[PDB]
Amino acid sequence: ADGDGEELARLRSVFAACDANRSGRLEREEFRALCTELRVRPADAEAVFQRLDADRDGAITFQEFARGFLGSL
């Protein structure tokens, strides 16, 4: 219980820190921009983004982000 609770808190913390524009989603441009700051190349950034953006609308919701963890409960 507490372990899963902590992991959800952890995922939200990562998501929120990534979400520089405070939209509640990870838009493509801000995701790319962070990857670039971390020196990850655009093809890798896009590979990871296209994967997370399940519905291909150009922004990763927290549902999409934590799909794997939430589906595992």
Residues that bind a second copy (CB under 8 A): 7, 10-11, 13-14, 16-18, 20, 34, 36-41, 44, 47-48, 51-52, 65-69, 72
The number of helix segments (H) and strand segments (E) in the chain equals: 5, 2
Under 8 Å between Cβ of 24 and 62: yes
User: How far apart, in Å, do the first and last CA atoms of the chain sit?
Assistant: 10
Minimum gap (Å) between residue 40 Cβ and a second copy: 6
Q: Choose the one of Ca ion, a second copy, none that binds residue 23, judging by a C-beta under 5 to 8 angstroms depending on kind.
A: Ca ion
* Residue nearer to Ca ion on the CB measure, 8 or 28: 28
